[PDB]
Write a protein that binds this DNA or RNA. Structure first.
Ligand SMILES: [K+]
Ligand SMILES: [K+]
Ligand SMILES: [K+]
Ligand SMILES: [K+]
Ligand SMILES: [K+]
Ligand SMILES: [K+]
Ligand SMILES: [Mg+2]
Ligand SMILES: [Mg+2]
Ligand SMILES: [Mg+2]
Ligand SMILES: [Mg+2]
Ligand SMILES: [Mg+2]
Ligand SMILES: [Mg+2]
Ligand SMILES: [Mg+2]
Ligand SMILES: [Mg+2]
Ligand SMILES: [Mg+2]
Ligand SMILES: [Mg+2]
Ligand SMILES: [Mg+2]
Ligand SMILES: [Mg+2]
Ligand SMILES: [Mg+2]
Ligand SMILES: [Mg+2]
Ligand SMILES: [Mg+2]
Ligand SMILES: [Mg+2]
Ligand SMILES: [Mg+2]
Ligand SMILES: [Mg+2]
Ligand SMILES: [Mg+2]
Lengths: 131, 135
RNA sequence: GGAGGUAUGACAA
RNA sequence: GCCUAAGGUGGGAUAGAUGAUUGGGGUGAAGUCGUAACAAGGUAGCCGUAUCGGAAGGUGCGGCUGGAUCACCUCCU
RNA sequence: CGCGGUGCAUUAGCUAGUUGGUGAGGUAACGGCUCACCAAGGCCACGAUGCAUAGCCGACCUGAGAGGGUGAUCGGCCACACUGGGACUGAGACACGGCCCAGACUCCUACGGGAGGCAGCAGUAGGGAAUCUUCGGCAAUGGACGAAAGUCUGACCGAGCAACGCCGCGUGAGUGAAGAAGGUUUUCGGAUCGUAAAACUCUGUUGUUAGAGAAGAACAAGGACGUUAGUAACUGAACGUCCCCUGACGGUAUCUAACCAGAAAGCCACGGCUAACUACGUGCCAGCAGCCGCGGUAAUACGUAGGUGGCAAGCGUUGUCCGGAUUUAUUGGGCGUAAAGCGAGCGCAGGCGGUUUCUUAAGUCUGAUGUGAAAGCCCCCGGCUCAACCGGGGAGGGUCAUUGGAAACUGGGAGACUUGAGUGCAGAAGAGGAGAGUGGAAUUCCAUGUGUAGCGGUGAAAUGCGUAGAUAUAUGGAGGAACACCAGUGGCGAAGGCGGCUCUCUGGUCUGUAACUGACGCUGAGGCUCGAAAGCGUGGGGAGCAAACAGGAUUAGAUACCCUGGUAGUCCACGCCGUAAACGAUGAGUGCUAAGUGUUGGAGGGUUUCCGCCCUUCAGUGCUGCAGCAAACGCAUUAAGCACUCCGCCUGGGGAGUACGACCGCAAGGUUGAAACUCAAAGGAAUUGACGGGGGCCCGCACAAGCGGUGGAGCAUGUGGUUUAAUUCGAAGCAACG
RNA sequence: CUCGUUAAGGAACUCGGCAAAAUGACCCCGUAACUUCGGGAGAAGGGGUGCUGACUUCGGUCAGCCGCAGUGAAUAGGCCC
């Protein structure tokens, strides 16, 4: 089934984060790779690695904690559910927590942040906030 | 609900209604139909004047009048104050408002309007109950 | 130690 | 001469007002009759159905625990 | 022509010149616009058709916004002109103040015949809760006509009435006390009305009077001149510069001066929500009341007086709209117990959908251009003594349109892959289902003997059965129904449900296998199917049990519980019914997320002589429990956690699962499914108490064991009634009555 | 007695629409409540019908003509609640 693997990915991250697990493994796709790389280079994750197996490329994540205890991620949320898909313009780009989080957007340029979108004056499909 | 459901049948609001349906309707003798008109007051003819017993926490003789309206809806109202010039066939003016004592009285009678005499020797809250100044 | 099954009483205050 | 509004006739459809009489419903300080439920409510109760009866309700069938009590098995601590 | 904006499916079919075509006609023009002919097509679940409702919009009110509600004044488009139809004229009508005809309605007649149409401005009647003078002028602005003056103009300018609304100013100001009297209150000392007043000083917004007296006016024509291009040439046309005259409002605005504090403040509320407190009268009466609720002899809740508070030429009240109301949740809610998961499944349509190359570009994003009238909202300016208001300029406003790019994502198309889904190989289990037959136990009945007075039943009895041989006892036979042990929060099935045994046929599930297809899947309205028990139809059957019913009892009564009997029914076959506390009171699917423990069916592995034990793993089936969730109870890899797709369902309680309608049904009745009116609660969970014909433990002249009394007599004393002029008043279960 | 016409009216006659009158054939259209779903139903209610030429693909059809009237006479249901 898996009618929303993006949200499954987000929720698996959330669950592991709540139990304070250290790593994850996911049946990956290119959009998941993009999101993982964005989180890697935005500071919500320590590390990410790839695995190539015949059915589908697995992607494994290594999460981040300020201490043994403190979490860097608090919660995520998909907006394009997809039952109601969220397309937005360069002015309607969200600002997650006045800049303390990040919204993840896909545009003509590619999969990017609200920073780059509101700078370039583009918009697109919103697929995830991150508090 | 899912958004598909909300498109297949949208949110249909909680239907509202009035505390005075008798005032929100009219009557034209030509076509003889209820004309829907939002009227604050009305005229009527008292078809009965009497007293009623109120609900349990209270005990009293509450003065009512059953009235025949301009729009041919017959209505029970309350005669506020102390004393009245009212009888059967006495023309009267009616305003809205419950009387929490009896259930079947959604209306009040107005003083100083028509055949209703102004209240006698009421000096405070005087506009209410409709009696001119003592000079 | 704990779980599943096996006659009438006035009204209001 | 064609077309044709109004009109007449006809059987239907549709919406409403009125209608002897009747049906239950709701409200109304101190009317009557029992006491069905709430405790094991004094026959455990309720749900559906049938039937009965002044009225609550009762009885049978099936189901449930939203069942109180003492006595066994299995389970967990 | 695209797109958009209102309710019902208790409205599912609609149309026949309707849909298209070949001709012809016709219109300013396209075309079924119209006629013939040919064909049978066309619209719709993306809501056609029908019913109801409604002018639409800019805009207005509200709101954080999303949105909601309205469509008054001003502007735009549309439609109408007593109702219906038709044309003429004309550039333009199928014509408000035009024609013809039909109808309704009225009017004047000399009674022969005519005439008319205020939803034009005023105005009348009526309706109504209710909203204007039967005014002046064309001076302005605009329009018709005319060469022009000018004529007309209920358009428009103005004035008038209305506190209907918004804005502004008033209704005097300064000084004036331990504080006049009087009102109210009092703890009788005082307190408050209160610097409020009187008094003295000042002012004249305003008002009264008398004088002065704007702008709005531009003009046009006319009297003069001058320039242009037309001229054979002048009048004349166009253009410029002077003279000339024009105001309903109105002798109003406005300004000046004289005078008087003099002529100018009330409404509601004061228990809490809510700012604001006492006195008197009243006594669940009078009355108050937006909600909670006040009032029953000491009312901050009624009424009055005083006092205070909020507003102020207004105040309050009703009615309507929005908000608060996340109380229809897109923003922005929920369904274990409160409202709600259809009883459950099979599946058409739709909604959603694994990874991935290439492609497109419908969605999406984006540049520029155009338009989105004006007025209005908003920003900056400026004039009205400020303000309202008025004017100028700007800004913004579109799920808007054309063109031009990207394409990451969704979608479209051409493929490719296997994890999902399914097929195949091999195995496992099983009250899985339907049909057929067979069984032992027990009851009931019948037969045969033994044996004889009670058996049965109850809290008590009794009805009953039994001496005609009961009960019971032993041997058989008939008949029906259900399957002791095994049997377990064990198994199967989608649910309901399914337990003896064997056979016939058959379904789903699980495990590995990794051969095969290669996203084929999930959900699934509307439909179809199954569906406890009761119940209905037809025919069999009927052992026991048992509604109804009978009788006995009980009871104040007992239409019941108890007893003895006992009919339908329970059972079989078919056909109907289609409801349940149809419950895990938890929709289905997928994924992720501590652990513990048992258990059912397997598989694999490491041992074990095998058995067995251990470790791993799948599919179920229980308990404990971390995180988290939860209003709590409780849930927790069989979620009620985190998430996503779809379906169903809820929007307070009752009325009411009722009525109306439709469908279904042999009927009973089922499915869908409201409103009027009514309440300010209904409800869930949990807590403390109290209670229990609930349990446990304990105690007390509490019972038991006993002794002696009261109640019966007479008297004393007290009490109740009753009589009395009074029989003083109080005391009323224990806890009043020597 | 058996028949036929009748002005205006039209059941006022009468115990009572008795009797008589009216309808009456064929084609086409259309046809309610209720229902045992078969019916009701020939419901009701309407229209047309003659002659002469063209026309069909043989019945419809068009045009014209005549009369108060075209099942031209006779024979044939009155209906509804
Ligand atoms: K059940
Ligand atoms: K209209
Ligand atoms: K018309
Ligand atoms: K008062
Ligand atoms: K039967
Ligand atoms: K107790
Ligand atoms: Mg009881
Ligand atoms: Mg009981
Ligand atoms: Mg009975
Ligand atoms: Mg709001
Ligand atoms: Mg006119
Ligand atoms: Mg207060
Ligand atoms: Mg008052
Ligand atoms: Mg008092
Ligand atoms: Mg519930
Ligand atoms: Mg504009
Ligand atoms: Mg049955
Ligand atoms: Mg638990
Ligand atoms: Mg004793
Ligand atoms: Mg004695
Ligand atoms: Mg004593
Ligand atoms: Mg005659
Ligand atoms: Mg007669
Ligand atoms: Mg006859
Ligand atoms: Mg004939």
């Amino acid at each position: 089934v898996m009618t929303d693997p993006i949200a499954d990915f987000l929720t698996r991250i959330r669950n592991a984060n709540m139990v304070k697990h250290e790593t994850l493994e996911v049946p990956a796709s290119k959009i998941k790779r993009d999101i993982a790389e964005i989180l890697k280079r935005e500071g919500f994750i320590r590390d990410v690695e790839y695995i190539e197996d015949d059915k589908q490329g697995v992607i494994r994540v290594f999460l981040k904690y300020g201490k043994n205890e403190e979490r860097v991620i608090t919660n995520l949320k998909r907006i394009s559910k997809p039952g109601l898909r969220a397309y937005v313009k360069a002015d309607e780009v969200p600002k997650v927590l006045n800049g303390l989080g990040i919204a993840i957007i896909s545009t003509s340029e590619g999969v990017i942040t609200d920073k780059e979108a509101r700078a370039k004056n583009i918009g697109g499909e919103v697929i995830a906030y991150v508090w | 609900p899912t958004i598909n459901q909300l498109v297949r049948k949208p949110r249909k609001s909680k239907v509202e209604k009035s505390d005075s349906p008798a005032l929100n309707k009219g009557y034209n003798s030509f076509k003889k139909t209820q004309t829907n008109v939002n009227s604050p007051q009305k005229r009527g003819v008292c078809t009965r004047v009497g007293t009623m017993t109120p609900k349990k926490p209270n005990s009293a003789l509450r003065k009512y009048a059953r009235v025949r309206l301009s729009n041919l809806i017959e209505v029970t109202a309350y005669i506020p104050g102390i004393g009245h010039n009212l009888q059967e066939h006495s023309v009267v003016l009616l305003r809205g408002g419950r009387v929490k004592d009896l259930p079947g009285v959604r209306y009040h009678i107005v003083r100083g309007a028509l055949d209703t005499a102004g209240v006698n020797d009421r000096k405070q809250s005087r506009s209410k109950y409709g009696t001119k100044r003592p000079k």
